[PDB]
């Protein structure tokens, strides 16, 4: 059942924690109140329960981590210096295929649903105008193109320094997210790209140039690859093999810079990434040439949101109290940390294989 650890340390992103604005480090002060609230709630539950009241009260700390690879590798060493961290679901599923049972998934995060994507169970069918994934892309275009993103105001779209609130329905928690495919060009170029998609002409489609993320990204690489493979049946085996033979058609860059590269017209991103990108950023996100437009072509199959995982030897009773502490803090609106990352809710994982692995695998087939 594991060892009771009187000191629990959460791993958090170095970039995030060591982050500041106008020279003011404010993230450190956010996680500080988060930790005070977490400690309070945890030991209250701990002490109110006869099964756990005799263990030592627990202190909570955080430690900054380089990247997810360091997080999963560090957790797998089962060292009490690092007990817990929240990781992207697809990366974790891949990690756990190669190193089964090595770490313990326990918590599932949820996020405010987008108003245009409230139903998880929508999947690729044929990529035509009646495809449910194309229909979500048309809904995105209403929000992002018809009322042009560049003209949104903080007030208009209710920016809260974190996200544009008007694009969300907080009454609905989504235990999922998707990737999406963007296209960009003048009218003639956009029609050509759509024609190549409608005609299933892979070579022409690909030669318009694709921006993508890291090869191990779900939402900026693998989920889009799945859609492309299913849509352009039998025209390539993997994106990596296609790129090897067609290097100039691919570039690793953020979708919000698509408008600045004349040679590229297609980009992968998280669904709705504009929702947490201030349009006033000095980097002019999603900006395009005057006679060009950027629009959504299609979104992807859905996969779970981020998963909280423990090193293996943390006492199981302790793990479940920690999971419940996250749930109650969000419910009591005492979680000052989560929403800064997109976590607006938490659920216990009851069956990892059914709730996480299977959902992910269905999405990428
Ligand atoms: C306020 C806010 N909402 C949403 C996000 C985006 N987001 C947070 S967790 C997550 C799911 C995992 O995505 P990611 O870590 O990019 O893994 P990938 O899809 O690249 O494998 C997303 C899309 C954010 N950064 N901030
Ligand atoms: Ca510890
Ligand atoms: Cl109990």
Swiss-Prot record:
Single biological process term from Gene Ontology: regulation of protein phosphorylation
Which membrane topology term applies here? Lipid-anchor
Top-level taxon: Bacteria
| InterPro entries assigned to the protein according to its UniProt record, in alphabetical order | CypI, CypI_dom_I, CypI_dom_II
Q: Which UniProt keywords apply?
A: Cell membrane, Lipoprotein, Membrane, Palmitate, Signal, Transport
GO CC term (a single one):
plasma membrane
The task this protein performs is described as: P37 is part of a high-affinity transport system.
Name of the protein in question: High affinity transport system protein p37
Q: Which organism is it from?
A: Mesomycoplasma hyorhinis
């Amino acid at each position: 059942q594991g060892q009771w650890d009187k000191s629990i340390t959460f791993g958090v992103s170095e970039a995030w924690l060591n982050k500041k604005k106008g020279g003011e480090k404010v993230n450190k002060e956010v996680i500080n109140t988060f930790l005070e609230n977490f400690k309070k709630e945890f030991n209250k539950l701990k002490n109110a329960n006869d099964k756990t009241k005799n263990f030592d009260d627990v202190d909570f700390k955080v430690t900054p981590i380089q990247d997810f690879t360091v997080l999963l590798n560090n957790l797998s060493t089962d060292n009490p210096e690092l007990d817990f961290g929240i990781n992207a679901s697809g990366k974790l599923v891949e990690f756990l295929k190669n190193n089964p049972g090595i770490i313990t998934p326990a918590l599932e995060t949820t996020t405010n649903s987008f108003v245009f994507d409230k139903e998880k169970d929508k999947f690729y069918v044929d990529g035509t105008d009646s495809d449910p994934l194309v229909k979500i892309a048309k809904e995105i275009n209403k929000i992002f193109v018809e009322t042009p993103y560049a003209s949104w105001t903080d007030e208009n779209h209710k920016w809260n320094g974190n996200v544009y609130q008007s694009v969300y329905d907080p009454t609905v928690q989504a235990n999922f997210y998707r990737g999406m495919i963007w296209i960009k060009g003048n009218d003639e170029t956009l029609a050509k790209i759509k024609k190549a998609w409608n005609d299933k002409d892979w070579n022409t489609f690909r030669n318009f140039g694709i921006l993508h993320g890291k090869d191990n990204s779900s939402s900026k690489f693998k989920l889009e690859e799945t859609i492309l493979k299913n849509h352009f049946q039998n025209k390539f085996t993997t994106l990596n093999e296609d790129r090897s033979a067609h290097p100039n058609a691919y570039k690793q860059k953020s979708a919000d810079t698509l408008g600045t590269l004349d040679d590229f017209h297609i980009a992968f991103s998280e669904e709705g990434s504009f929702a947490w990108t201030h349009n006033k950023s000095a980097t002019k996100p999603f900006e395009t040439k005057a006679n060009e437009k950027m629009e959504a072509l299609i979104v992807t199959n859905p996969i779970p949101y981020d998963v909280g995982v423990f090193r293996k030897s943390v006492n199981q009773l302790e793990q479940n109290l920690i999971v419940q502490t996250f749930i109650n803090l969000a419910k009591n609106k005492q979680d000052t940390y989560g929403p800064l990352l997109g976590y607006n809710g938490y659920k216990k994982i009851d069956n990892f294989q059914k709730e996480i692995v299977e959902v992910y695998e269905k999405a990428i087939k």
